[PDB]
Amino acid sequence: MFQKQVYRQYTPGFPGDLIEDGPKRARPGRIMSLSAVNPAATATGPNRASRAFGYAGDVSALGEGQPKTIAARASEVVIGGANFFGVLGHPKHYALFGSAGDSLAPSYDLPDGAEGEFFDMATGLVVEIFNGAAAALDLDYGDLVAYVPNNLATADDALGLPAGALVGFKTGSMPTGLVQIPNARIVNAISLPAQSAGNLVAGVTIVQLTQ
Amino acid sequence: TDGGSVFSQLVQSKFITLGVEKRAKSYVEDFSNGTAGALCKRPWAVVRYLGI
Amino acid sequence: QGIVEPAGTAVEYGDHTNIPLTSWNANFERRTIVRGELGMMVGTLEEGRASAIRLNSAETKRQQAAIGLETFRNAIGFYGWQSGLGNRTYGFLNDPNLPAFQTPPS
Amino acid sequence: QGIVEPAGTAVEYGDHTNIPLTSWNANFERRTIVRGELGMMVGTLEEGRASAI
């Protein structure tokens, strides 16, 4: 939308980009549509970057006759998930793919059946963080993070939250229905304002230590 | 990489003659033109005052 | 048209310290083309009657067609075309990404 | 004296849409001419006495 203000310095980084170099683990995968989930999904959302994903199944069979050919090792994932399969990242790898209203529009969404890179271990990862309980929250250096499941009950989801959004919380208190990513730390302090249903603040970009 | 071009006007054509149709007791002509508006690439180099 | 938007920040030096990284984010902007039209029609009897007062009806109507198109184009430059509905045309005094008016000292 | 007063407006383009048209409407104005007069009279005796001075 063009630069309407001149600042003294540039932004540290963008969500989905690695910000520090160190030990790292990532695997490829393919995306399943939410409609294919058998017990139906109570929480829905797009396949947006910088959001958690869950394991779905194995698609390495590649055949239908009596002798099958296993020529590759592949896995497929779902946006919400209950079996953690990393966080989507590295936006420079993919393409715009266009948008519904018009192409050439900014978006982090990815179509179903596309291939992405999901990070399990990362020294520094810029992500988009959310807030729970609809109250002002200060994270500071060492809080934990969790992500919304597909099957989150509507009672525990009063604030409309995406399918796989990342939510930070203090050690003592955690929202009732969430899945905690083991051994993850906030690393970068951040403050978030109060929230309301339908008017959730998107939060601010933040560094992450996935493992 | 491009030039400054803080403000510019995008014009495709100024006058186009579509055609003429002749009838028994009259005739009709048509004309057309096209434009795309104005572009502001650098809005930080513009200052405006509503008072005077 | 496109934008570049680089990013990056530095930290203090260390021998075993992790390495900070830089990146960038490109965007694109679009504008829409608007077309207009105008016509004219002359009858046989009206053309002959108008010639009685030394006035050319056909030529007079032809000139108004060109002037009306120029009024349309001039207005689009100053004010956008259906920007409220969602059309991305914009104008000199109606571009949403503009610094907005202020007040003079006097 | 005469006046022209043209008219016309434009619409958006369309392959199968209708064609707008233009028009004009004339008018006239008038002024009135006025005349005046003025005369003189000279008498026989007053002419002679006028030459005295």
UniProtKB/TrEMBL annotation, chain A:
Superkingdom of the source species: Viruses
InterPro entries: Struct_cement_gp24/gp6
Pfam families in the cross-refs: Phage_cement
Name of the protein this chain belongs to: Virion protein
Organism: Pseudomonas phage vB_PaeM_E217
Organism lineage string: Viruses, Duplodnaviria, Heunggongvirae, Uroviricota, Caudoviricetes
Automatic annotation (TrEMBL), chain B:
Source organism, top-level taxon: Viruses
Name of the protein in its database record: Capsid and scaffold protein
